[PDB]
């Protein structure tokens, strides 16, 4: 039916074709191009240098 655990290795061609009983064609080949960590941040403060005034 389904379901494996692949390791995340870039550029490795992983072959899954686990499907229902009976011969099941049209396999999944999957390559990982990149993982992309998409940030979930809270802004604590903004800081930059300053203009001093007399």
């Amino acid at each position: 039916y389904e379901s494996t655990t692949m390791p995340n290795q870039v550029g490795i061609p992983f072959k899954a074709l686990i499907e229902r009983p009976g011969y099941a064609g049209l396999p999944l080949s999957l390559v990982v191009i990149k993982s992309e960590l998409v940030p979930s941040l809270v802004q604590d403060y903004i800081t930059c240098n300053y203009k001093t005034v007399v």
């Binding site: 403060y45 903004i46 800081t47 930059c48």
Partner: protein, 53 residues
């Protein structure tokens, strides 16, 4: 996910290169400390800081 991780923590992201720095916010009082200038309104000149003159 089986497990998830990021090497990020408290970070201060310069445009020169991201750098890993610790700090404690609202803790100004003194002439040191990373990120002594704290500004939150970008429509106002207020900054919380400690400086010496």
């Amino acid at each position: 996910i089986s497990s998830a991780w990021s090497p990020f923590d408290k970070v201060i992201v310069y445009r020169d290169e991201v750098y890993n720095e610790d700090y404690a916010p609202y803790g100004s009082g003194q002439a040191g400390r990373f990120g002594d200038i704290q500004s939150r309104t970008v429509n106002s000149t207020d900054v919380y800081a400690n400086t010496n003159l």
